[PDB]
Amino acid sequence: GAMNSSNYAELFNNDIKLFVDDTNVYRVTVHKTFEGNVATKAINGCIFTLNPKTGHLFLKIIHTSVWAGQKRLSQLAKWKTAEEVSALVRSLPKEEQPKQIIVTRKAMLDPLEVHMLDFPNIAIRPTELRLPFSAAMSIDKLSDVVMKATEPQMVLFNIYDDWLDRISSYTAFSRLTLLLRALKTNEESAKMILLSDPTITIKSYHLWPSFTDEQWITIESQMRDLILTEYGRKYNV
Amino acid sequence: MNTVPFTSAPIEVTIGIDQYSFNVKENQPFHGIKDIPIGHVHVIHFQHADNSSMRYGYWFDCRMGNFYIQYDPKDGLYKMMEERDGAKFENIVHNFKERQMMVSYPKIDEDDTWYNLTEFVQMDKIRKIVRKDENQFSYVDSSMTTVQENELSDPAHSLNYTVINFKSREAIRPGHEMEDFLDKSYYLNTVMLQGIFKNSSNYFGELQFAFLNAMFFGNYGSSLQWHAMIELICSSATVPKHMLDKLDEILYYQIKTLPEQYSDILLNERVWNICLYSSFQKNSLHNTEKIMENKYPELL
Numbered sequence: 001g002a003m004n005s006s007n008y009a010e011l012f013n014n015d016i017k018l019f020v021d022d023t024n025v026y027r028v029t030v031h032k033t034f035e036g037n038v039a040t041k042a043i044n045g046c047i048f049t050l051n052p053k054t055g056h057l058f059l060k061i062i063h064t065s066v067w068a069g070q071k072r073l074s075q076l077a078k079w080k081t082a083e084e085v086s087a088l089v090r091s092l093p094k095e096e097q098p099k100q101i102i103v104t105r106k107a108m109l110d111p112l113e114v115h116m117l118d119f120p121n122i123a124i125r126p127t128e129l130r131l132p133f134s135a136a137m138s139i140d141k142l143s144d145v146v147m148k149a150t151e152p153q154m155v156l157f158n159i160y161d162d163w164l165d166r167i168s169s170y171t172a173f174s175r176l177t178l179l180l181r182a183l184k185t186n187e188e189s190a191k192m193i194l195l196s197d198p199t200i201t202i203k204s205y206h207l208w209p210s211f212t213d214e215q216w217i218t219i220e221s222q223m224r225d226l227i228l229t230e231y232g233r234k235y236n237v
Numbered sequence: 238m239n240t241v242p243f244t245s246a247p248i249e250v251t252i253g254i255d256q257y258s259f260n261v262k263e264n265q266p267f268h269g270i271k272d273i274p275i276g277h278v279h280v281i282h283f284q285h286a287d288n289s290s291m292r293y294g295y296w297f298d299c300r301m302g303n304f305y306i307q308y309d310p311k312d313g314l315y316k317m318m319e320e321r322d323g324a325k326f327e328n329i330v331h332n333f334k335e336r337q338m339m340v341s342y343p344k345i346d347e348d349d350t351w352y353n354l355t356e357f358v359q360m361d362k363i364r365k366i367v368r369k370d371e372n373q374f375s376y377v378d379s380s381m382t383t384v385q386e387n388e389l390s391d392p393a394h395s396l397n398y399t400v401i402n403f404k405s406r407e408a409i410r411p412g413h414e415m416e417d418f419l420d421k422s423y424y425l426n427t428v429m430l431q432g433i434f435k436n437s438s439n440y441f442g443e444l445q446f447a448f449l450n451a452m453f454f455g456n457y458g459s460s461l462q463w464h465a466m467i468e469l470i471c472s473s474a475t476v477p478k479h480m481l482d483k484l485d486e487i488l489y490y491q492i493k494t495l496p497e498q499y500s501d502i503l504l505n506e507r508v509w510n511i512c513l514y515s516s517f518q519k520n521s522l523h524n525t526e527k528i529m530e531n532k533y534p535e536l537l
């Protein structure tokens with residue numbers, strides 16, 4: 001069924017599973033036209049498909065040309081997402097195909113179910129976790145590849161860098177969701193935290209800085225403080 | 238006009254004949270139903286006074302044989318049987334009529350409700366949904382499951398309605414996923430009408446039969462089928478105009494006939510609100526919408 005805090009360790013068992021987040025597929029800016037009306041301009045988006053055990057991120061870049069001359073784009077975006085996830089599964093060797101796909105938004109259930117009718121043994125599930133994957137475009141190297149794309153493209157990343165050499169998947173996912181939640185809540189302050197110290201850099205082949213184990217503890221504490229600080233500012237606490 | 242005689246009435250029972258019903262007391266001198274209109278299928282149905290569990294009954298057409306009812310004290314029910322001795326049968330009916338031991342089918346000369354409810358229902362199609370090939374009449378009861386209900390348990394006692402499933406490969410062309418799910422015209426017109434039913438008359442016959450089994454027996458799987466067949470049409474952008482015109486007429490009669498106090502259990506709020514107010518055909522069901530709003534405004 002649905003996925004929540006009771007069965008959270010299930011994410012890190014040995015059954016292949018993918019999260020799918022569609023919140024950055026259809027991205028628009030709203031602006032005033034010459035006649036005083038409002039018009040939208042689309043910008044490139046992406047599907048965020050993540051294996052939470054391994055960190056493998058299948059980032060399908062959605063180029064604005066896919067919306068040309070289409071209507072009800074917010075509805076189409078869900079079906080385009082389902083089409084692309086189905087295509088990804090079919091491209092994977094059988095032993096790499098997921099046993100479950102967990103969608104972050106329940107509006108993705110029917111589109112994905114219909115596209116995956118040929119895979120009756122892949123479970124399509126919602127989750128009751130509120131996951132901050134919309135903030136993926138706050139990761140500079142992900143935002144850069146999406147905005148520079150001139151055509152549809154799939155790019156593969158490991159969103160955990162090399163962390164799994166030193167920590168468990170459970171801990172890596174918890175670190176990722178804390179980082180993304182902080183970037184979602186206050187992007188400027190989170191990036192300041194991550195880059196404040198010039199002697200710690202991001203390797204060419206990584207997304208995040210090369211923190212030692214002790215520095216990650218400090219960083220994680222500063223991210224928790226940011227989230228709590230912003231909660232106090234929001235609710236006047 | 239034809240006659241279904243009863244050997245006797247040994248247990249107290251409410252007897253239905255089509256949309257009519259009457260009570261018979263234990264061992265009362267009741268010997269059947271005469272003046273039964275030729276030209277329509279009919280259903281004779283039963284609910285025991287001492288055990289309202291199991292409504293059950295028999296679909297039949299008096300043009301296909303001489304049928305009668307006899308109580309079986311071992312299986313505990315009124316059974317329909319066919320009498321092959323025509324002269325014996327006529328002699329029995331004539332005697333019971335002479336002694337005025339039969340009730341007259343209560344049709345009003347102005348009243349076309351049965352024809353309107355069974356316009357497309359034929360015995361041959363009933364006998365393909367209800368499989369018991371040795372009888373010319375068909376038994377249905379409140380508990381019988383449908384083939385689709387048995388896929389999600391005795392196959393010989395099942396209602397073989399046409400399976401409709403909106404999230405199935407039959408309903409959804411590879412490569413037309415969005416198109417076929419948001420608009421069901423392919424599934425309605427190519428798969429169901431052209432492919433399975435052959436024409437809209439057979440589709441409407443099964444829809445009408447499902448409704449009547451839902452209403453007369455409280456058969457839940459029949460109610461599911463009735464609503465699925467409505468939703469398939471309403472959720473299709475492209476439907477032949479004559480089908481749209483006739484469906485409104487068919488649905489109006491079904492909503493008008495339903496017992497007011499059974500509406501909570503025989504009508505699916507989601508389906509009706511979607512069909513009347515959100516679907517492609519939301520503006521094609523004039524009279525069905527008018528009677529629904531005046532008779533069941535709560536559901537909406």
Ligand SMILES: NC[C@H](N)c1ccc2c(c1)OCCO2
Pocket residue numbers: 272341342343344345
């Ligand atoms: N079928 C003709 C027969 N005379 C008839 C007609 C209407 C009736 C009725 C009997 O009994 C009472 C209810 O209304």
Ligand SMILES: NC[C@H](N)c1ccc2c(c1)OCCO2
Pocket residue numbers: 482483485486487489524525
């Ligand atoms: N072209 C007339 C059409 N057959 C029609 C449609 C709806 C109806 C009806 C007749 O009379 C019954 C109530 O609703």
